[PDB]
Design a protein around this ligand. Sequence first.
Ligand SMILES: Cc1ncc(CCCN(C)C)cc1Nc1ncc2c(n1)-c1ccc(Cl)cc1NC(=S)C2
Ligand SMILES: [Zn+2]
Length: 287
Amino acid sequence: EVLVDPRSRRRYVRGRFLGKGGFAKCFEISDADTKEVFAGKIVPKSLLLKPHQREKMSMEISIHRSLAHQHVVGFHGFFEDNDFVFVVLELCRRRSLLELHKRRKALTEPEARYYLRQIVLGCQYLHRNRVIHRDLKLGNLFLNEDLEVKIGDFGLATKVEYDGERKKVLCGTPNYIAPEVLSKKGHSFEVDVWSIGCIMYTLLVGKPPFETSCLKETYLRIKKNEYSIPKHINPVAASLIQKMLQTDPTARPTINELLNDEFFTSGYIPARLPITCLTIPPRFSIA
Ligand SMILES: Cc1ncc(CCCN(C)C)cc1Nc1ncc2c(n1)-c1ccc(Cl)cc1NC(=S)C2
Ligand SMILES: [Zn+2]
């Protein structure tokens, strides 16, 4: 019920349940002194009996704590007792792109541009810091009160240690999983750009690129590149999706190139979005 840090002498009440991912149960929490409000991932040690498991949890924190950016969920601290691990993160009051997508389905182009821009800004930061998220999806992309985007859940993230490194395995299963991970051909940064492609598609279209009833049939399509963009999607968008969803990872654009695509440069990107837009499609009228 209460959660105490020895080293910082800070105590947090446990509030409402938000969700679960991996071994973590995540709750809204508040500091007993400042009444300031946080997001609290609570991982049971009962599930970290094995070294391999313990190291991932330990890597997650190492990576997350190394991060400070406008579009990355703010890291605030960690502590433990004998039974549980406790990680304290920024609370994103307006949930995630995933909830938005289930309420609104396909968004308008300029909403997509807005979110997409922020996502690519968060990811540019990661990549310049030699970090690959490896699991970017709508459920990961969080929204603060101003509907600003915060990348979260670093539990599949890896740090690149040397130039031209090719990671050989990925422990766990990403949602928008790159074809080169599936083919166990080795992988690096292009997996995040891959995911963004799927996310762009999903925001513009109202459903994921490669969906089927069998995950393993989905995996099949991802290998064969079997997906179509409907004809009502704009061809400047279509070009981008197509660019980002390429089997050959050397062909896909880097994160730093993406904001200089016609799709951002010759299209309208809102400075901000109103709350209304959580539920009602913004027409963007001139007055
Ligand atoms: C306040 C709030 N309410 C509802 C949701 C939606 C949770 C389920 N959705 C992602 C499928 C999100 C938030 N905001 C919110 N804000 C910060 C976090 C979280 N959620 C959160 C929550 C659940 C999980 Cl499993 C991971 C997780 N990750 C991070 S880095 C901290
Ligand atoms: Zn493993």
